[PDB]
Design an enzyme around this catalytic site. Sequence first.
Site, mmCIF file in Angstrom:
data_model
loop_
_atom_site.group_PDB
_atom_site.id
_atom_site.type_symbol
_atom_site.label_atom_id
_atom_site.label_comp_id
_atom_site.label_asym_id
_atom_site.label_seq_id
_atom_site.Cartn_x
_atom_site.Cartn_y
_atom_site.Cartn_z
ATOM 1 N N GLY B 137 56.649 10.921 59.237
ATOM 2 C CA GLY B 137 55.673 9.988 58.708
ATOM 3 C C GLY B 137 55.009 10.446 57.427
ATOM 4 C CD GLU B 174 45.826 15.119 61.561
ATOM 5 O OE1 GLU B 174 44.626 15.430 61.707
ATOM 6 O OE2 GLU B 174 46.431 14.355 62.342
ATOM 7 C CD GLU B 245 47.308 -17.184 47.378
ATOM 8 O OE1 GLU B 245 46.222 -17.000 47.969
ATOM 9 O OE2 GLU B 245 47.831 -18.311 47.250
HETATM 10 N N1 GTP Z 1 46.909 4.870 65.043
HETATM 11 C C1 GTP Z 1 47.800 5.483 65.813
HETATM 12 N N2 GTP Z 1 48.355 6.681 65.412
HETATM 13 C C2 GTP Z 1 49.263 7.306 66.198
HETATM 14 C C3 GTP Z 1 49.642 6.750 67.410
HETATM 15 N N3 GTP Z 1 50.548 7.570 67.982
HETATM 16 C C4 GTP Z 1 50.754 8.625 67.165
HETATM 17 N N4 GTP Z 1 49.954 8.485 66.064
HETATM 18 C C5 GTP Z 1 49.902 9.405 64.918
HETATM 19 O O1 GTP Z 1 51.080 10.182 64.915
HETATM 20 C C6 GTP Z 1 50.812 11.482 64.440
HETATM 21 C C7 GTP Z 1 51.753 12.490 65.092
HETATM 22 O O2 GTP Z 1 53.076 12.347 64.614
HETATM 23 P P1 GTP Z 1 54.069 11.297 65.313
HETATM 24 O O3 GTP Z 1 53.963 9.950 64.645
HETATM 25 O O4 GTP Z 1 53.689 11.191 66.767
HETATM 26 O O5 GTP Z 1 55.552 11.920 65.202
HETATM 27 P P2 GTP Z 1 56.516 11.777 63.917
HETATM 28 O O6 GTP Z 1 56.022 10.752 62.927
HETATM 29 O O7 GTP Z 1 57.914 11.437 64.370
HETATM 30 O O8 GTP Z 1 56.522 13.241 63.250
HETATM 31 P P3 GTP Z 1 57.084 14.528 64.035
HETATM 32 O O9 GTP Z 1 56.293 14.744 65.302
HETATM 33 O O10 GTP Z 1 56.966 15.742 63.147
HETATM 34 O O11 GTP Z 1 58.534 14.293 64.376
HETATM 35 C C8 GTP Z 1 49.351 11.740 64.768
HETATM 36 O O12 GTP Z 1 48.707 12.350 63.674
HETATM 37 C C9 GTP Z 1 48.740 10.377 65.011
HETATM 38 O O13 GTP Z 1 47.807 10.099 63.997
HETATM 39 C C10 GTP Z 1 49.088 5.549 67.820
HETATM 40 O O14 GTP Z 1 49.414 5.051 68.893
HETATM 41 N N5 GTP Z 1 48.165 4.919 67.017
#
Ligand code: GTP
Lengths: 434, 430, 51, 426, 427, 111
Positions: B137, B174, B245
């Site tokens: 992400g 993070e 818009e």
């Molecule tokens: N708003 C929101 N954020 C989420 C949710 N679930 C996970 N996250 C975010 O996801 C982050 C953790 O990484 P993930 O998205 O779970 O995993 P990934 O993107 O595949 O990355 P890797 O774990 O390194 O493989 C956290 O910092 C959260 O902020 C959710 O249900 N809602």
Amino acid sequence: MRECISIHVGQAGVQIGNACWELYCLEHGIQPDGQMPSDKDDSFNTFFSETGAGKHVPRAVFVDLEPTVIDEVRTGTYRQLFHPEQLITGKEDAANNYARGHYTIGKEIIDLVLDRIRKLADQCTGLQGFLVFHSFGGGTGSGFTSLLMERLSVDYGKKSKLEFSIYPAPQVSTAVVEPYNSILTTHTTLEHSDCAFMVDNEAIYDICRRNLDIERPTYTNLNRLIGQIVSSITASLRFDGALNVDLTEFQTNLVPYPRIHFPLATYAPVISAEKAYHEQLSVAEITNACFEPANQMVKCDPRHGKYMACCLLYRGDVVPKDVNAAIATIKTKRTIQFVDWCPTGFKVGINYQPPTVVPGGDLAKVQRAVCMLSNTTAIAEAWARLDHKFDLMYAKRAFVHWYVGEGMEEGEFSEAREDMAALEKDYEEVGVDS
Amino acid sequence: MRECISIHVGQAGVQIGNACWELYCLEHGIQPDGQMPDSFNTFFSETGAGKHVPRAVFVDLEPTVIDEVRTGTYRQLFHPEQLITGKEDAANNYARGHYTIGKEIIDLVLDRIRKLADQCTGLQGFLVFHSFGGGTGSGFTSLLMERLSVDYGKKSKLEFSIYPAPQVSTAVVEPYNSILTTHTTLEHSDCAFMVDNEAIYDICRRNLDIERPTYTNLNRLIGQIVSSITASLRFDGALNVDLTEFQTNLVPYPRIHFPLATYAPVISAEKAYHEQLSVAEITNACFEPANQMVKCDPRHGKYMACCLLYRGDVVPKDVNAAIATIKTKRTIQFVDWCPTGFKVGINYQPPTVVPGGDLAKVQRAVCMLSNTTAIAEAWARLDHKFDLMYAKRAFVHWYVGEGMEEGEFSEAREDMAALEKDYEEVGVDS
Amino acid sequence: NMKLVQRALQDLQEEADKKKQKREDMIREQKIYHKYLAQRREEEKAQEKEF
Amino acid sequence: MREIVHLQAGQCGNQIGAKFWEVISDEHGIDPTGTYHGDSDLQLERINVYYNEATGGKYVPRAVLVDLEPGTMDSVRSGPFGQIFRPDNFVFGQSGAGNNWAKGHYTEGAELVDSVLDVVRKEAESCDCLQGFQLTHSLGGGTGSGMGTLLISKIREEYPDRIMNTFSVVPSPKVSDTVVEPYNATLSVHQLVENTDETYCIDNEALYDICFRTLKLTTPTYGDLNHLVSATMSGVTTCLRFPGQLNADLRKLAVNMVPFPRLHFFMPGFAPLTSRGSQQYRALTVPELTQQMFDAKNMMAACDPRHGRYLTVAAVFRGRMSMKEVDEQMLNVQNKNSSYFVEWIPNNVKTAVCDIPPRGLKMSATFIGNSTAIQELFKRISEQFTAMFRRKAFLHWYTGEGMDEMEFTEAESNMNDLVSEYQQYQ
Amino acid sequence: MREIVHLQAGQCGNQIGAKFWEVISDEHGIDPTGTYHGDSDLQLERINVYYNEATGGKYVPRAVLVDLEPGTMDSVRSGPFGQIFRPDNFVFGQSGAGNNWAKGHYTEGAELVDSVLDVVRKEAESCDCLQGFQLTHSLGGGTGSGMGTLLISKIREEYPDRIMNTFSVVPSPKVSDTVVEPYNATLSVHQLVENTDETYCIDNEALYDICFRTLKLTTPTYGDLNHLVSATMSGVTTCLRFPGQLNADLRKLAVNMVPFPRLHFFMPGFAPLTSRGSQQYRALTVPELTQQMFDAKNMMAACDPRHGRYLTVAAVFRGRMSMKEVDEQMLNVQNKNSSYFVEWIPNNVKTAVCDIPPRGLKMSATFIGNSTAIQELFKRISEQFTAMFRRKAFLHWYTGEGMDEMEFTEAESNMNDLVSEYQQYQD
Amino acid sequence: TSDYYRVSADLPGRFNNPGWFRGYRTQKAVSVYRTSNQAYGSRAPTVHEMPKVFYPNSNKFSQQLAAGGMFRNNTLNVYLEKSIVTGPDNCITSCDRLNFHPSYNINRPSI
Ligand SMILES: Nc1nc2c(ncn2[C@@H]2O[C@H](COP(=O)(O)OP(=O)(O)OP(=O)(O)O)[C@@H](O)[C@H]2O)c(=O)[nH]1
Ligand SMILES: Nc1nc2c(ncn2[C@@H]2O[C@H](COP(=O)(O)OP(=O)(O)OP(=O)(O)O)[C@@H](O)[C@H]2O)c(=O)[nH]1
Ligand SMILES: Nc1nc2c(ncn2[C@@H]2O[C@H](COP(=O)(O)OP(=O)(O)O)[C@@H](O)[C@H]2O)c(=O)[nH]1
Ligand SMILES: Nc1nc2c(ncn2[C@@H]2O[C@H](COP(=O)(O)OP(=O)(O)O)[C@@H](O)[C@H]2O)c(=O)[nH]1
Ligand SMILES: [Mg+2]
Ligand SMILES: [Mg+2]
């Protein structure tokens, strides 16, 4: 009136011909016993002859040197279809020797092969051409095909003899004399063939791995796709079309020079039966999969070269408005490129009758399909990969003692080298622009 | 002929990918098998046999979360080739997800989106979802932006971001993941919303009367925001808005493309019984910092511009009646060079309530998008802690070990440093 | 003029009914052949187990 | 009395003519068997313009069908009106040309040109007074052009003072189908300029724009297109078999519209077409009939009248109308467009009216116009032709079949001066 | 005889096209099918002024509808009166402007002006003596403000001497609904002052004011808003389609209404409005018509006449009414409100009457008036625009599309000399 | 086939019913001694495999004209003197410039 003759050389030829003839019988509704169901039209006449009893006999010759591959044909389900003099069997195999299959072993049955060829030409009233199915790998399919093409060129003036071939894969190979066999067929496929198609094993392997969702496919699943391609070629002969083509038609419209008759053949779509429930299948959606470099059925990338000519054959519910719309879309983008001395490089044909599904096959029931045949400048890399390997093997003068023994002279390898280098330089001089 | 592509990145992205598409199917009346019992053509594509495939590409670098989608209730609705899995993940690393591991599937997704963009006769713009916390992400999403910039020049790429919370964090690196993506979304994001997890956490505590919510109840809320944004394309209204818009009518400068997203009303079915909801009584809740979805207070800042999305039986008379009462309050401020900062949209059909959801069936709603200067309040908390972590030279042994140069950290902090200064210079009145 | 109007309307209605019939036919045929495919997969698995 | 012989060349020509006989036999009220089923005697008076008498109250069309494929005409006879042809007129070759202009002109043409010629000479001398011949063909194929042009030069020499009307389907760049398409069309105009009386320039891409925007068909198959082409063929010769207040046959129009012997290529257009949704909203009167005729979108060619200068204009009306409303509406267009029309030929109007309208229609008209924009098509074919010929591509299938390398150069030069004398006359 | 082709620009142009063509069909007796179902032959004597003749005893409106976004095109054609307009007239682009004046004037409007003027010229030349053109467009939207200037500037050079009517939907300070709306208003008034003969000013904040205190509707949707502005716009072109005692045309009003070519911003108003519960308390008498109208509450735009001066006001009446009662009530307002009118033009009122009233009514009235409180709207548009430009707001949306920043400052200088010229005529 | 798949009614009975096909290989239980070629032609076609609509080529319909010989002219030589005037009573040839149907003139005798 229209009639073509199949000649299947080698074990690969026999398996390909068995797949193709099973496909043709199920396509034309003809029982394996030979006759049509008589409880209720010249679609069969393109490849079958009529006997006195009302039986259909295919216009093919299955020739291979090994005894073991023909007795399976004589024992299996289609034992009744073939007249037993079509199935031509040698005494010893060539043992993957072009020299043995050209000079010693193949000179015993050539008289029988030419007698059956004379008999089928006597039966024919006027023939569109022969189709010879073979591979560059084996000794039979190299050498016996090499002098068979010469015999047909001497005995037949200008009749079209397509040479469908399987090229040796650049990485996966089942032989050590494989480049020695392959390079000495370059003079054969240069001037004894009016047209010369080739497919590569590794590319069909990759497509059967990915698109068809088969974990462990095999030679039957490859021969299904080969038969589908040849069926889409011959549907212009067999069935009426809104716009129709012929073998002479696309060989003239595709071959630009007397030395350049090496197309690349792909098919679209090749999809899975579960994903057919998922995907839309329109002509504008299947014309992309012909020119995707991943789905090309030769392990050579067309993005490195420049396209000269394209041939397109559509089957099913295909309309010229959407065909021309798809061509207008695909012409614009810079990823697809054309040579500067060929602005209108396409040839297009449409047939109403869709391809027919097979019992035990892997594809789905498809309403709109397309077969594509391109003449490219991307084959230079695919032949250079075999060039470097063959010179690398012939560096220390290896595997020469037999070929010296049976009777080919030592300088014929250098003759093949000079022919191959001249042909690659012809590719370079075509590939240069202005 | 309006249509948009959903793109979702990461374990956050796939979970919000299912929850957003669970809302879409019940909104357009679609069974899980994919067949009915021209609104859907924006997000679907009709088959000759009549099957409607959700027109999205799910990307992830772990097979553990995609497989539940391939096994669950909607396993036949989603196309098999659309949910794309990696082989090994970056594990909360930007550099692993950027320079080393993410390039293995950068070629696969750029062929899969072409099969869906060739279907785009006219495409309004892509939507991309990701989370800054994860490796894919942050890392692969960073290299996703340059390829979508080179391939398509001016096509719209909105994004919902998951920015780290100031106090509660799921990781230590993070902030390292979040800061190194600031430069990518600075120049390669057209619009860029932000929503923080702990700002949603307090909302479900005090508004929805739920003792112990989970990520499912958070995923339903963010899906309500994307529904009201795209409702004008699919459903006609008195004033229809477009993706083009509110991009123009909210974003004053090319360097400032970071709104804040709110939703109102968000109340329980127990609180839907008692409280009468009118147009004025729901648009005021987007102004309160308690209902704000980013942990920052616009009272310290100033409203740059305001975009309103109204849903349901909303009279245009009540729209202009509340705006006059809104503008009389001196607790809110506007800049001196945006005297008319409002942009409104109206859709007739009320939103769809889901079984297993928590909000009640409501006739009126607001999804207000207001750009503020109070993002620099929340940005300063993270920018303090990135340099606080980097002061003693920690965790960078992994990032250098991936191959990427040490100086990319120093240029990323300074790219963020003058970005705050640019956000400060706008706030000065003439 | 009324002859022309009525003929145009009836041709448009005929085309619409033909297209609707084609779509319904496609739906039924695809459903049937997918059920047949499921039966055939069960058969091949049974033969493999027996061997 | 004034007799027209029909010819069809190639697979393109057979599909043009098959729809054409279905149009006019129904127009004259003729069953697929061939007998007469008519309501008015005005149909029965002139049938002998195209038809030949037989026994049992039957009429057979005076047509031949020429194609270099042995099995291509079985589709023609299997059609709804296919059995009406005399089986003694079907002429065909044994081996196909392969879209090679050389094969239909040198190799395969010589064995078949004699067999076609004595057929057309046999049924020509039996007629009363031969007004002209009529040929439909395509300039994109070997058989339609090569056998077509080999017939045309011999028709002119065997019949020196006659009328020889041709229909040319010129290849188009965006609806290009054949790789050797420019090679065929460059050598075909060479024989089409020096022994041809009349020629219409119908183009495939312009047929698609009519279906795309004006007619609004979802599935423009080749059958619907040939209905549009035959309607242009029906409207130009409707004065030859039907009485009119002001008559104008083929001999009158060819004299007036051709001021110089190398200017015989015209651009057709058709007027009444509308969509079935918009049919009830359209007003069918005389002044709105010529509104859609002048439209650059409604042209049947790939050129722009706004770019070009009209040489001469003609509109053959079909229906019942007064004369002054035809005169005053046509005169206003010439006066209001004071820039496009040529200045040294004042009053460029040609008028043709027949009282009998087609079935299912009360008002119609057809367009023929000579334009100076014709150099757009020929120069566009010229630049594609000289691209292929510079690097010597696709010649061994033509050089080894009988010609030299210099026939293309003199054909290019006879095409180079053709666009130049269009430039000075512009 | 006299024919005027209708022009529609923008999404706002569509629902006023649907509403106006509904009401004008009701007063002339046209069914949703298209044919004629009437009870008096006077409705049929003058029909080609706005309708187009067609075969089948039907009339298609002689209108062109221009929009850059196809979303509301289906809403127009699927309405109760959506099957009357001919499908060829509906013209639309593929990419919308998105509330931007710059998109619809330089980059995206240029590829569509060729197609829409192909439609316009084809149906324009069919009439014997075309009287003029009539445009309704919104300045609050990108298409109405961007394309609306580009069509008008082109048709002026194509037809140098022809009557043209424009309806300008101007922004509001209270009912502002677009941030970049002052940018749209400034860059078009310069085009609207050089290339327009006659205009009216309509603001949405004025319509909300009418429905509150006079009509007494709790929910004034845009359908009722379009009802009022169509009745104003139907009320001026009455002598074209029905004769009367003193008939006056759009050319006859204009020659008595514009003294100088830059003074064309005129203010409308409508007499009949009342409520159903107060319906029995109202008497339709010509003193009551001039009483209820002259109140500043019933003005149709954002102005106040007490801060300005009446140059000239025009009168168009409906109903069989005596000429002397028309004459005496108009002399008394000149006698009583002696400070509002100018001094150097005597007899500042021009009057017109028509015989028959519209359906459901027996008497009505409408005025067109030239006030100097229109510059109050121009100062309000200028002041928000000039402040916005020192901080360089949204210039990347404008400068990067091809234009320069000097096009804004010449637009400011042109409107500043417009309001200065407005101020000198006041004193 | 007609039970499930509706057809265009020009197909033959061999495609309407697959039960006429009987030469295909029947199915036995699989065994250890098996040949990989026995995949080809292993099984008779079921109802879901034959095409619905069939378009032949009927080449004998043109072969019956091809085999006889192409039409030729061998001294079928006649020429008819024809006139330009419509009337059957008068036949004015270009060579013979003389009027026919002589005028019965009262005054002048015998032309
Ligand atoms: N708003 C929101 N954020 C989420 C949710 N679930 C996970 N996250 C975010 O996801 C982050 C953790 O990484 P993930 O998205 O779970 O995993 P990934 O993107 O595949 O990355 P890797 O774990 O390194 O493989 C956290 O910092 C959260 O902020 C959710 O249900 N809602
Ligand atoms: N594509 C494809 N290639 C095949 C197939 N079967 C054999 N080959 C090729 O055939 C080559 C070897 O030749 P053989 O299969 O032994 O047949 P042959 O050419 O007659 O050679 P001999 O049997 O020794 O006479 C290998 O390199 C394979 O690539 C097949 O089913 N498909
Ligand atoms: N207008 C029209 N053109 C056609 C049709 N069919 C084919 N063509 C054109 O004819 C060309 C091919 O000519 P061809 O059939 O090979 O001519 P032949 O060799 O004489 O039979 C293509 O380029 C098409 O554009 C048709 O039905 N209508
Ligand atoms: N008076 C009036 N104003 C309207 C109407 N519809 C919309 N508007 C105003 O026009 C603005 C929207 O115009 P828009 O749709 O963007 O115009 P376009 O971009 O040219 O199509 C809104 O701010 C409304 O206040 C209407 O029916 N009447
Ligand atoms: Mg072998
Ligand atoms: Mg992951």
